[PDB]
Each structure stands twice: as structure tokens, then as C-alpha cells.
Amino acid sequence: KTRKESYAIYVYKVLKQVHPDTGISSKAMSIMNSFVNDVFERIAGEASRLAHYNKRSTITSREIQTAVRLLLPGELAKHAVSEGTKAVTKYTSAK
Amino acid sequence: DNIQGITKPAIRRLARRGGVKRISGLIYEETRGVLKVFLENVIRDAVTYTEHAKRKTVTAMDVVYALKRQGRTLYGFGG
Amino acid sequence: RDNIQGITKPAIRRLARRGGVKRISGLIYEETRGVLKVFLENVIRDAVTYTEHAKRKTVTAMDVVYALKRQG
Amino acid sequence: LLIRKLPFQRLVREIAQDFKTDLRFQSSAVMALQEASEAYLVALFEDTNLAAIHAKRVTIMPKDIQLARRIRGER
Amino acid sequence: PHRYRPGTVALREIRRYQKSTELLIRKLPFQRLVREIAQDFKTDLRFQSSAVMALQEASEAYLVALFEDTNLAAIHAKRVTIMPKDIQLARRIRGERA
Amino acid sequence: KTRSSRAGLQFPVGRVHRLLRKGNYAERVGAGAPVYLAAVLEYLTAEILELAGNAARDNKKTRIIPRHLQLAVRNDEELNKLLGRVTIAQGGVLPNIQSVLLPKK
DNA sequence: TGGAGAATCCCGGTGCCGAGGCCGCTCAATTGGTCGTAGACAGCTCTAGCACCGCTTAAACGCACGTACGCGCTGTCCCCCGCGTTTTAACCGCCAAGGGGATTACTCCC
DNA sequence: GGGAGTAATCCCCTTGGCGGTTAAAACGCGGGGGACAGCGCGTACGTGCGTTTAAGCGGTGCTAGAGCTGTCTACGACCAATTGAGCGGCCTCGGCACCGGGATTCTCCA
């Protein structure tokens, strides 16, 4: 049989990191898999034309942060850029 | 024609789902005409990019692509 | 500070005839001022974002082209 | 243009001060702002013209003006 | 015999249909409808059931949206009854038809 | 050993990275950019599943149907701002009745 | 305005099928070294936006004032609405002809 | 030197046809309350003219941030080997809706 990549296990351990005793059916997992896929190619879209509008052929994270501040409004954007900032600092401070 | 299979109590049920309190009998022909407009638009785009893939069986995936060129895409079908 | 009243009501009434509206009530004007202020606050936020990422501190023509073509 | 220039640059600068301090503006970009905003507000007034005519009225008011903003859906 | 007043029945209907989520239009008339419509462009077009139900759910989304816009436009017009002139006005102000 | 363990992250960096590479957006890429993008992903999906669990405790259900997700996305003004442009398969509509349509007696 | 009547709800009992683990497999992340490379940083140029100001001015503002029609109220009537009745085609499902998307190799082209 | 058309194939997928049946489409019909014509009104709103005021455009400083370049050096592609994260067949027991029927709660007019 063929192989298909899936994100059931990943958001699965995310939700058991957050919600201990809650089950989820197949339809909600499918619509959120399509959601995370859709937000992936769209934000790859803004990353692409911020790269090419700034005459750049290289993706750097600064463009991705800029892309998410250009689309996502409000204080949720500030929380997202904050948690991502701590994520990339604990990435760069790793051994 | 098979548009008479879209019955008027189904239109009543979907209008009560759609939030309409009081319904007259003159909306059905307008609804069917605009249904022709949107549905032949979507199916011409879907069969166009179905035959762009050189296949003859129409699945839901290129349907989701034809919806996401419109800007009101539909989730849960690998999109 | 307080320059929302700079949009004069005869300029709004010229916007009404080129918009084609025959008669205007007095309550229209501050509503339209709020709508244009909301939309301007929406677009200048993107303009500041394009200015900040481009390692510059001024707004140019391609910046406003992108900011106006993003929403359609 | 019929809306006047220098309070429009002043108001755009005043609002941009709430976003980031001390920006400098090219003239042509602000002209692009002016012509685009003129286009959208003209459009919304033939929208309100059709709203008022369909409401059997000749004078518009902000209640009718807002229902159009929920027709487009912005807030 | 007992006969309920109109409007309370509509209130119960709108509550039980805004509570519900099931597809109310039958699948076989819509299936033969899209078969006949697909026969117009090219012959022998074959549909998966997933595409049919996805287009069906999309049709529910657009019709419920335009019904809610119709309702807000009609209560904006100081009426409870709906008329087709509301349909052309709601389709023009949406900008879908120029 | 994996970069997910060293990053303190939980979504796969390599899978989204190879999705970037076969996405052919540009030629060269940074290192922490998919880490940032993945971190934004579990933040946003964690907020979505938090609101889904909130709806689950609201309607006495422990297994989540997308009713929970539609109630979660359509009561928040930010989620109505971001996902008002997008429809939902098996979405449905909230109970909303007008003031005049109420039986004013 | 309260009771007859009917819709709703919720709990006792129930059956079912799929959510989630269990184990087998398997192949792209991972290590690490190398080498092309392109943009970070420093440096030279340059030019026009901003600031300030003065001569002259089209337009805004605000009150006076006449009045046109949106709204309140009155009267009408008719048109789908609730209830009852009658056909009806949608759907289970079982089978069945067959059809074709993807799975292997074979060989060609810019 | 790897993308692309060409050839069997097959087993899962497409489509449908036929028997039963069953809640639903649609029609019939009294009807009554909201759509809608008609009058009073009065008020805000259109227009018109004195007054002002910011305004439209020129003139100059100027400098400092945009625009272009040298370069080389850290930084990303990429390629041989590995394995454990992460794909799939299989099994099981519990979440949840169905059946049902009494407690609970709108509805109107006498």
C-alpha cells in the first residue's frame, strides 16, 4: 500500500500536553490537518513574495515574523512572536 | 430538468436554517437561476483543471482547488 | 491631534454627488469619518510594517502598491 | 482629487505616530492613498444610493450606512 | 381542535434548524442534477461522492449566507416578508453580479 | 538527537523543511525559520484545541465533534476576523434571531 | 389570567463500531565535512522632503428660511400558514458489468 | 541524464437496476394580521450670501537617510551512511445515540 504523511500523532501529543481527558473524532482531525496545511502554503506565499519583493533568494526567519505581523492583527500576534522568539533563542542556545 | 428535485419544502427548511422568518413563494426561480450561475461556474473550472490533469474521474481535491482560487476555501478534504 | 474634522462636510457632499446620493442627513458625516479612519488605520499599519522590514524609515511607492493590492 | 491634501498628510502622520514614531512620507505614495480611498468611498456611496432607493427613501442615514458594512462584513 | 398561531411554529423551526447540522436536500436529485449539468460540457464525466458532498456543503454555506443577508436586508427594509427585488439588490450590493 | 528535541519544539522541523524545499519558493533557507513557523503552529492549534475543550466542557461531551470547533471559532472576534473568509465543512450556523422578529406582546 | 394539550428533556437499558494502542517495518532526518557564494558591514554619493514663509484666494461656515416627504396613524384585503390528506421517489442492498488510476518496465528527447 | 509517453492489469472503484417501504412533497382551504394606499405634519435639510481662513504655489536650506559598490567569510547546498521516528495491519472495549415514557415547561382565552 502507498504512504501518506499525516499530522495525527503530532497535534495528538500536543492535545495530551494540553487537555488530558478529551477525545477527538476523525472529522475534526481532518479539518485541522487541512487547516495547518492551508496556513502552511499561504504563509509560504507571504514568505515568498516578501523574499522576492526585497530582492532576496534566501528565507530568513525575520521575513516569517514580518509576514505574521503583516497578516495577524492584535495582541495574539504579540503573544505568537514572543513565544516564537523564545523558541528560536532556545534553538540557538542548544548544544 | 432535474432542478425540480430541489423541492420547495427543502427550500423552506434551508431558509429556516438560513434565518428567514417569513417566506414568499417567488424566491425559488431566482434561487435556481443563481444556482445555475454559481454551479456551472464552479463545474467549468473543476472539469477544466480535471482535464488539465489528463484524468477523466472528478474527485473532491480539484474541487477544493477551484474553491481556493475563489477565496472562500472549504476545509477537511486535503486542502 | 484631533484631525478627523479636517475632512470637510462639503468635500463629503462632493463625495456624495460623485457617489450619486441625492440627500444627506447630518449624522452621516462622523460615521463616514470613522469608516475612513478605520480603513486608514488598517492600511498605514501595513505601510509601517513594510517600512520596518525593508531596513528603511520612509514609505515609498511600491510599499503603498503592495498595501493596496493585498486586500484586493 | 477633491479632498484636500495637507490635512490628509497630517492625519496620516498623526495616525502613523500611534504605530511608530517619526516616519517620513513620499508624496506619490500619499497620492496613491488618496485616490484609492476616494475610489472605495465613491463605491460605497453608490452602494448607499441603491440601499436608499430600495428603502423607498431619498435621504441616507448611518443606520442604512452600517448595514452595508455588514453586507461587506467589516467592523 | 387546536391550531397554533403562525410565527411560533417558525420560531421553533428556526431554532431546531439552527441547532441541527444534517444535510436536508436529498442526495439523488442533486446527483442527477450535477450529472445532467456535467453532461453539458463534456460527456462521460465521472464523479466521486466526496466531490458531490463537498459541493453540496459549499452550496449550503453560500445559501445560508445569502439568506442571512436577505434577512438583515429585509428587516432593514421594515418588513418580515421577502420579495425578489431584495434578491437582485442583495446580489448587486454583494458585487457578485456587476 | 533530533532537532525537535534540541529546539525544545514538538512539531517536526524536517518535514516542514522538506515541504519548503519541494515548494520551490526560493533557493536558500534559514535554520530557525521552520522552528519559528512550527512554534506558531502549536501555539495557534493549542489555542484552538483549548477553546474546543472549553466547548467540550460546555456541552457535557468528552469526544469532540466539529460542532465544538465551529462554536469555538464563531464566538471569538479574532477568530471571526481570521476565519470569517473561510467556510467549514459541516459548519452550520449559530442561533441568532433579530429583536423585531421576537414576539413583542 | 390557569388548565388541556403538546413539545421537550433526561434518565434506565442497550448495541455498535471505531479510537486508540500493539507490534512490524522502513526510509528520510541525522553526522559531518566541504566548497561555492552573496549579502553584512563599511563607505562614497546625492537629492528631495521637510521646514519655514509670504502673496493672494476658492472654498467653508453658519444662519435665514421654505417646505417635501418619512413617519405616525387609519383602513383594507389577501396570501401564504397551520392542519389534513394523498401520492412518491429516496434509499437499503445485492449484485453485477465493467472501467480506469496507479503500478511496473521500455525507450526516447532537450 | 533525468522527465515523459507508451503498454498490460487489476482490483478497487463507478454506476445503476430492481423489490419494498415510508416519512415526506404538494395540494386544499379558512383566515387574519402585516404589506401597503392615503392624510397630517413638521422638521431637518437644501440653498444662498457675508466672512474668514487655511490654502496653492513659489523659493531656499540641507542633510541625512536612500542608493550603489568592494569584499570575503561565515553560511547554506549536498552527498555517503545510519537508525529510530514514524508509516501501516489488527484488536479491543467504551462513548454515544437509539427506545421509550414520565417529569418539566410554552400557549391561549375564557
Residue numbers in the entry:
A (entry chain D): 29 to 123
B (entry chain F): 25 to 103
C (entry chain B): 24 to 95
D (entry chain A): 61 to 135
E (entry chain E): 39 to 136
F (entry chain C): 16 to 120
Reproduce passages from the article.
Unlike other chromatin remodelers, INO80 preferentially mobilizes hexasomes, which can form during transcription. Here, we report cryogenic-electron microscopy (cryo-EM) structures of endogenously purified S. cerevisiae INO80 bound to a hexasome and a nucleosome.
In class 1, the hexasome is almost identical with the unbound hexasome, without detectable additional DNA unwrapping. We find that INO80 binds hexasomes and nucleosomes in opposite orientations, with Ino80 binding near SHL-2 on hexasomes and near −6/−7 on nucleosomes. We observe that Ino80ATPase engages the hexasome predominantly near SHL −2. In contrast, a gap at SHL-6 did not inhibit INO80’s sliding activity on hexasomes, but a gap at SHL-2 slowed hexasomes sliding by ~ 2000-fold. Our structures suggest that the Arp8 module requires ~40 bp of DNA for appropriate engagement.
